[PDB]
Assembly symmetry: C7
Homo-oligomer: 209 residues x 7
């Protein structure tokens, strides 16, 4: 009682399990120290003031990708998990009853998977292409009531920490997602791997006998 | 043995699972540093005094939305989970026996779902519309016995930290909830998707055969 | 095999599940900073002395409600869970055998539920009515051997932190418990919702057939 | 297949479940700050020296009840759980076979339960009766090699913290245990609630039919 | 299908479950502060130096019993769990087949249990008998390269903390183990509680019928 | 119902379970202190500045192997788990039906396993061969706005901590993987351990009878 | 359906369960303070510098046994678990079919168990024999850029902490493993405890009937 094609199931399993694995690896205890951002406060600040400076410049951010990278990986995971979820609803009644129109549904689902994979490839290539030294910046807490007093200085050098691991994991993800696309575009050609529904039924009964 | 319509079940599953997912994402270890609020205490304060200042100005709050945002998302989740819970009690006896008045119950439940979705859309639009720089304020601990002594200063610049993630997640939630409403208003029109009970029974037996 | 009435079961489930949910929400990591009380110790005290001052003024307390609020909510939960627990023992033998005197037991249980709900309403109204600024006070550690030395000062401004969330959650609980009472007083009128036992048996067999 | 009397089972369940619940409530995160004892060390002591002073005066203790209160509640729980455990061994063979001497066993078990309940009442009354201000004392670390040096002072004011919650929970426990005793002494009178074994068999078969 | 005697099973269950319960109680969060040992370092030492002093004098230890008390309780638990474990191997074949020599095995197992109980009684009496003030000592870190420099002083007063709880729990354990021995020595007399195997078979079939 | 050869299954189980075990052992609480990297900051820096220096020089890195060693072990584990995963898909249909071409699949899978084992051997030999003193380096935070000020010095000696355990675990892994290769190359010779499919079927039915 | 001999199974269970139990006991919260190593840094070092000194001298190590003792115990556990694992593969086919050559396999497995037990005895005797005062040493951080500056001193006294517990647990393990060897060498003599396969089959059917 198998409702899917083994190659397509393996592709869906890999494409959605890789970014969650990279999010799990990027913040492991093994590879990473405790603080995400760090700003060099002067030597007249207490603990609480330097914590205020770090917490302010962390919330005062180009650099949007460096902060929200795990959320973007999770978004790619969800948007890539959606096409098989849409496929299950349209498929399981008709195949549960039997075992044209289903060719359109199957081709559109695999097409959406291919487009999401290509957009992930473009985004990860853009993320790796940018300068590694473009992870540090100059923050200024002087705002509001702190605009006139000369106790604090103007510029604060701030540096994100977990960005090099993000570069490396995006390289790994891009390397996987580049060679993942020939498999899905080979499964795109429905009548040759044995556009009518009869061919789809043939390739759905060859493994469910 | 299915007691519901697949499209309505999917809509209920998404509308109540999205805000809990956003609450889970907004306070993840990955995206967020440890302290919610931060106030710049002067450099003559110990740790405990600056902790007192932060704990006072956190409890001395417009800004009500910036503090109670997860509770409001949880309230929207609960108020949106209530209509299917009311539907189950009125439905499962009559449909469990069989498989006018039920049209009124079904239409009122979907109407309440639509109204809650629209109110969530209005609230999230209001929450995103306000100024991003309107997250910081000027707190004053001078009250009670601390009204006359000149050891502490008058104004304390305070800043909330997790507010930008709240803006972004409210944008995502609004984007989902805008396009969610055409689906529920399409399911609102009961006789065309095949106001008498016979049509409801037809669309409840087409998927439970 | 249902031993209860659906409306009464839902009422019992809500009335005992709401205060536990509010206790769970009031001390969540999301909404609340780490320390309950905070007292402004002078700038010549070490960490341990300020911790002693906070721990002394926390244990040197009108303000009784501000400290023991979760215990009072738990007490209302337990006292409201007791009437159905008493109902089960008197009911399940007679109804398990069959399916006057039971009218007295049922009416007394619902009456006790109504009285507990009304007392909860009165207490939460009293708790919300008091001044929000009446959460801070003036503590004095000068007692015992510390009565004569002039190293420590006399007055210490102390402030409770989690009190505004208590005001808001008591408002929510009062709003629910006000509109909960019409339902239980409607279920109080036993012969009209179809004082003899025959009517109770009719309304216990209409849903268990 | 019920081997007990419902009223006695409920009494045993309450009498042993209340003190464990009070021990669980007295040290909850909600109600209680982190440190049990606190001593005001002078302002020339480091962290480690004040920790040594607190750890010494915590282990240098009338006040025995204030330190070992949860252990005494656990002891009352165990000593009150012992009579039904003794009852099970003597009862389950004879009742498992059948369904004088058993009257003696049943009366002695309920008598021991009554005596333990009364001793708990006396102890909790004594614990509540003592002065609330009798929780703080004067400790002296000057002993051994620290008997002659004048770097440390003689007297240290020390204060226990979790004692007021102990007073309140002992009041609650006493209030429950006072009204618990009429129920057990009513179950003590074996022939009237329908000293021969025949009456015990009658009241053991009326609920196991 | 019971392979044991109820009284002996209860005795084995209590004698091995009490010391584990005391080890669990002696280091509970409720009763005990965080640090086991504490040494009064002078007021010119940083945190790390005082931590070095405490960690050195904790590892530079009469006092052997005060440090390894939970390990000795665990050793008594294991050595008292061994006789029933030896009994099971020799018993379960012969009794599983049937239901002289077995009298020797049973008497030797109960004898070893009695000897272990008596040795535990002697050790706990010795542990309680010693002076309560004999828990503090004078440690000297001056060794190795730290033998000539006069920056650190010679004597350091050190104090163990969890020793009074050890005295109290050893008193409780001794009180239980004294009155436990009449039961096991009553079970030692095999023919009277109804040395031949026939009597053992009689007292093994009276409860397994 | 066994779908594999016992020797090959044991080899796959060991080759993928050893590096995960070494990753688990290298960061155990037992063997390792809390901080991975450590840099000697001057004695005019606060806590937060030294934490900034450590967090900067940890993210400013030959030495790539010393930082990403657990990820490389995980990569070897995954790349060595892939050949049996590929074998299962091609094998389980044909063997599930039956019990040339399968010789090619089996030989290619075992060949890929051998190549991955050899590459792991070469990498671990290279990792052990390098100097143990080549774990410490000279970091410079002077960049950006911190290029001209003379408050901070130029050179910072930094040292990785968990590298010696990495040397030892790579030695252990190399010792295992050297003697693992004779077993897999003995299983490579398919017709002698009883290239046609008939011999493979003989050695797949000798253990599944 | 028992595939083993009870005495041999008990021996394997004890010999592999004892070192894991000792590793679990040596790092328990009860017996051990938080830091493994400790070095007396001078009183002009901040927290981070003393943490750097401790982390450097912990990674700059005769003394190899004092650092890697749990790994060596785990290695003895694994090397002692290997002979029964090898025995299962060679035994379970032939005994599962039936119930010379098996005498060789059984004798070689028990011989390897005896050799591993003897090597463990020799190693633990060597570990206990060495001086208890040989746990402290003199470390020098002066290397690299820190070779010429006179801000830090040359010698640092360092001390391992958990070594006395290692001595005691190795004594316990040696005491067990000495008296464990007569049992395994008694099971080594196969024909007397009833070298041909027939005797092995006799002693494998006497307990599996």
């Amino acid at each position: 009682l198998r409702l899917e094609l083994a190659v397509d199931k393996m592709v869906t399993c890999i494409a959605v399990g890789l970014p969650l694995l990279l999010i799990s690896l990027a913040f492991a205890q093994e590879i990473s120290i405790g603080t995400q951002i760090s700003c060099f406060s002067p030597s007249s600040f207490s603990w609480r003031q330097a914590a205020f400076v770090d917490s302010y410049c962390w919330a005062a951010v180009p650099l949007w990708l460096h902060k929200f990278f795990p959320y973007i990986l999770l978004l790619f995971a969800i948007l890539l998990y959606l096409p098989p979820l849409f496929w299950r609803f349209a498929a399981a009644p008709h195949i549960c009853s039997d075992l044209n129109n289903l060719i359109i549904k199957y081709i559109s689902c695999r097409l959406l998977t291919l487009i999401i994979i290509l957009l992930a490839c473009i985004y990860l290539g853009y993320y790796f292409s940018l300068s590694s030294l473009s992870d540090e910046f100059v923050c200024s807490i002087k705002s509001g009531i702190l605009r006139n007093d000369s106790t604090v200085p103007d510029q604060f050098q701030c540096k994100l920490i977990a960005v090099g691991i993000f570069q490396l994991l995006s390289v790994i993800n891009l390397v996987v997602y580049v060679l993942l696309a020939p498999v899905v575009v080979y499964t795109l050609f429905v009548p040759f791997r044995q556009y009518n529904d009869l061919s789809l039924y043939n390739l759905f009964l060859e493994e469910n006998i």
